[PDB]
Amino acid sequence: PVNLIFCYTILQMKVAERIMAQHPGERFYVVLMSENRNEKYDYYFNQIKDKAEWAYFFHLPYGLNKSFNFIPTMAELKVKAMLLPKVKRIYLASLEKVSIAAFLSTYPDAEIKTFDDGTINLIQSSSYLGDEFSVNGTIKRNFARMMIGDWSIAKTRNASDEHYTIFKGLKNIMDDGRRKMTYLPLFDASELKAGDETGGTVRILLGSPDKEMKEISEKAAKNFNIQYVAPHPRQTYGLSGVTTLNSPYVIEDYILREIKKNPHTRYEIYTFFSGAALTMKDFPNVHVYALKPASLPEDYWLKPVYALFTQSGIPILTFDDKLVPR
Amino acid sequence: PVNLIFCYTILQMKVAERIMAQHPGERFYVVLMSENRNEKYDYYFNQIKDKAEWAYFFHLPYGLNKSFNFIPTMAELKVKAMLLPKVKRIYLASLEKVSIAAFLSTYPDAEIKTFDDGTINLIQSSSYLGDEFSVNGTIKRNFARMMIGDWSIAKTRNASDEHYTIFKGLKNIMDDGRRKMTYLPLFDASELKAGDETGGTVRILLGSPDKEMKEISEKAAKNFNIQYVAPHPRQTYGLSGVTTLNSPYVIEDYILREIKKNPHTRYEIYTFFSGAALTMKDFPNVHVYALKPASLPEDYWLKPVYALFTQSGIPILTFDDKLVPR
Numbered sequence: 001p002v003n004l005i006f007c008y009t010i011l012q013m014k015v016a017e018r019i020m021a022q023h024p025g026e027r028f029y030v031v032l033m034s035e036n037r038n039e040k041y042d043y044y045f046n047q048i049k050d051k052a053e054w055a056y057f058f059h060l061p062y063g064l065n066k067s068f069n070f071i072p073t074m075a076e077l078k079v080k081a082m083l084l085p086k087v088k089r090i091y092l093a094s095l096e097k098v099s100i101a102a103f104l105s106t107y108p109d110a111e112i113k114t115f116d117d118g119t120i121n122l123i124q125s126s127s128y129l130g131d132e133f134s135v136n137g138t139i140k141r142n143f144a145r146m147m148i149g150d151w152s153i154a155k156t157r158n159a160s161d162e163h164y165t166i167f168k169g170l171k172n173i174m175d176d177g178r179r180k181m182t183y184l185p186l187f188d189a190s191e192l193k194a195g196d197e198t199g200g201t202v203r204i205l206l207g208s209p210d211k212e213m214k215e216i217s218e219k220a221a222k223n224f225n226i227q228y229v230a231p232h233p234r235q236t237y238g239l240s241g242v243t244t245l246n247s248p249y250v251i252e253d254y255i256l257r258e259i260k261k262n263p264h265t266r267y268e269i270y271t272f273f274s275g276a277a278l279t280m281k282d283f284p285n286v287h288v289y290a291l292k293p294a295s296l297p298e299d300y301w302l303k304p305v306y307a308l309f310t311q312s313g314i315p316i317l318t319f320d321d322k323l324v325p326r
Numbered sequence: 327p328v329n330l331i332f333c334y335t336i337l338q339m340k341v342a343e344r345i346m347a348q349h350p351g352e353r354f355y356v357v358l359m360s361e362n363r364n365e366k367y368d369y370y371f372n373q374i375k376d377k378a379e380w381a382y383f384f385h386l387p388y389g390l391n392k393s394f395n396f397i398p399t400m401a402e403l404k405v406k407a408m409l410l411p412k413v414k415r416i417y418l419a420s421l422e423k424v425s426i427a428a429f430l431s432t433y434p435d436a437e438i439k440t441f442d443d444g445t446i447n448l449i450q451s452s453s454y455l456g457d458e459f460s461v462n463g464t465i466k467r468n469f470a471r472m473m474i475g476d477w478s479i480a481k482t483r484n485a486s487d488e489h490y491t492i493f494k495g496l497k498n499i500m501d502d503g504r505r506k507m508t509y510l511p512l513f514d515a516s517e518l519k520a521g522d523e524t525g526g527t528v529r530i531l532l533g534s535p536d537k538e539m540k541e542i543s544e545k546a547a548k549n550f551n552i553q554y555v556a557p558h559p560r561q562t563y564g565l566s567g568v569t570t571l572n573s574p575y576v577i578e579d580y581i582l583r584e585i586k587k588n589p590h591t592r593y594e595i596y597t598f599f600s601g602a603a604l605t606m607k608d609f610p611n612v613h614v615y616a617l618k619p620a621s622l623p624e625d626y627w628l629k630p631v632y633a634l635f636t637q638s639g640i641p642i643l644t645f646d647d648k649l650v651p652r
């Protein structure tokens with residue numbers, strides 16, 4: 001049970017020290033946010049870093065703060081004023097209307113437009129009222145409560161007149177009658193000259209970013225005879241007995257480049273319900289399968305996941321991972 | 327006249343590229359905010375950085391984001407939940423209630439307390455209605471408008487029950503009847519054993535953080551025979567013909583240490599209206615003078631500055647800088 005202290009000046013750090021010294025029995029995490037760093041800032045930061053359970057120094061880009069902690073001279077006012085970019089329009093993910101609300105408010109005349117955060121935009125508002133999310137005190141209830149509040153603020157504050165979605169024919173939580181919905185297809189699969197699948201079959205597993213899925217992933221590769229794994233961008237551990245594809249690309253861009261080079265190859269993509277199944281479903285010579293390991297509870301994935309996959313015509317394969325050695 | 331784009335994922339960067347490519351005649355500044363960095367993130371960031379007029383990659387500390395751009399598994403939900411510190415209380419500068427509003431809202435049950443941002447807290451609410459600030463279209467009007475809105479949100483949203491001020495006997499803008507006001511004296515000048523000023527006189531100029539004040543500062547040093555300059559923590563240029571004090575301390579802490587070592591020395595502090603005049607006024611053997619250079623317009627400092635200095639018994643010296651060579 002901790003106390004937070006946020007500072008953006010040296011004198012504020014000195015106030016933080018006095019507050020901490022008067023509460024010697026309490027835990028403190030202290031964050032300094034500053035556009036300046038030098039031995040004076042460091043000296044006082046290190047003093048706090050010595051007294052606090054945890055301390056972090058965010059070293060910000062110059063000019064982010066349009067107000068003033070001190071009383072400005074006309075010259076300081078004039079410099080700040082004419083430093084400030086003129087902003088006609090802001091584009092951001094729909095939930096960044098929540099997390100960067102405060103910054104949006106400083107450009108009330110800017111036109112605002114949003115785009116999908118990710119597959120979180122595919123859960124419609126009613127689903128958060130589902131029984132799955134209505135046991136009190138559960139992690140699932142708190143998640144839904146958080147999401148209901150965030151979508152409400154994203155939809156009703158700082159009016160934005162347009163929303164870009166990358167998902168064709170799937171209802172968006174941002175489709176609420178307050179804005180224009182625009183389909184923006186990310187991936188051009190038109191110029192590939194794909195032909196009949198008369199070459200080999202290449203099987204790729206989509207890596208999970210979660211280390212706990214490691215054993216189930218290795219078993220999937222063995223079970224379905226998958227030679228390759230495309231690691232998740234946030235994935236940080238390795239799979240054994242599978243060849244890892246090392247590439248700067250995300251899987252969709254990697255696969256487009258492969259289809260063009262290999263227009264007769266059958267590509268099969270195996271995934272524990274990755275959003276990539278939804279962006280790739282209509283790529284030529286690409287065949288996507290979701291894997292549902294039997295050793296996981298049925299509710300390991302939220303119910304809207306299963307509905308979205310079957311609505312998208314993606315097969316869901318029950319995989320008896322416990323029948324696979326190691 | 328620019329467009330801003332805020333992204334926190336790779337697919338969002340790919341949406342940003344499509345938006346930019348459809349607006350080839352427009353200017354774009356693009357900000358990526360991410361807890362992850364690797365060759366996939368870098369690859370797509372560099373693509374944007376090549377197409378945008380300006381791009382910045384804020385590499386955030388892990389765990390700052392409590393929501394999800396993708397639909398979470400029960401395991402992802404559980405990990406996030408039990409990563410999250412339990413927060414009983416948050417302390418921040420009064421105007422950080424504005425700039426970190428969004429983060430405060432994620433701890434609605436936390437007790438909130440504030441402290442002064444700096445001398446900006448000494449301008450009372452009525453002064454922002456002064457004639458000085460009511461010419462339309464002026465930089466001074468826009469400043470006051472911004473400040474009226476920010477103080478209103480700091481006072482009336484995210485209720486905070488206490489405010490710490492470091493200034494004794496000066497009315498705080500946060501003294502609005504909604505909170506307890508607490509005087510928190512930063513500086514202990516009790517154990518110094520200062521005696522009669524029977525030694526020499528040491529004169530120190532407070533450096534200005536603004537490069538344009540350089541010539542006026544050098545002239546002050548010559549005019550008043552000031553041997554030393556204590557540079558402002560944000561000060562980044564040098565003064566010629568004056569000895570610069572190089573120290574990790576801010577001036578108040580430096581001066582306390584000097585009085586204790588030199589209990590018979592007279593210290594005189596000369597300043598272009600630094601907030602340090604207000605924190606130091608009652609230090610023993612410390613004599614503060616504000617300098618008002620004749621070559622600057624009378625309204626170079628805002629009127630509340632002059633009133634606060636004279637209310638604090640700090641002499642204001644008219645300095646005819648144009649009468650000083652070089």
Ligand SMILES: Nc1ccn([C@@H]2O[C@H](COP(=O)(O)O)[C@@H](O)[C@H]2O)c(=O)n1
Pocket residue numbers: 118119205206207208230231232233249250251252273274275276277279337396397
């Ligand atoms: N193994 C994986 C999984 C996801 N991804 C990328 O991450 C994007 C988001 O996937 P998720 O919603 O599963 O996190 C996918 O559309 C794809 O571009 C990838 O490149 N490789």
Ligand SMILES: Nc1ccn([C@@H]2O[C@H](COP(=O)(O)O)[C@@H](O)[C@H]2O)c(=O)n1
Pocket residue numbers: 011070071444445531532533534556557558559575576577578599600601602603605
């Ligand atoms: N030349 C200066 C000016 C200010 N300062 C520090 O900066 C604090 C804030 O000063 P201003 O409000 O002028 O920016 C002062 O109280 C003092 O601690 C300093 O150490 N040396």
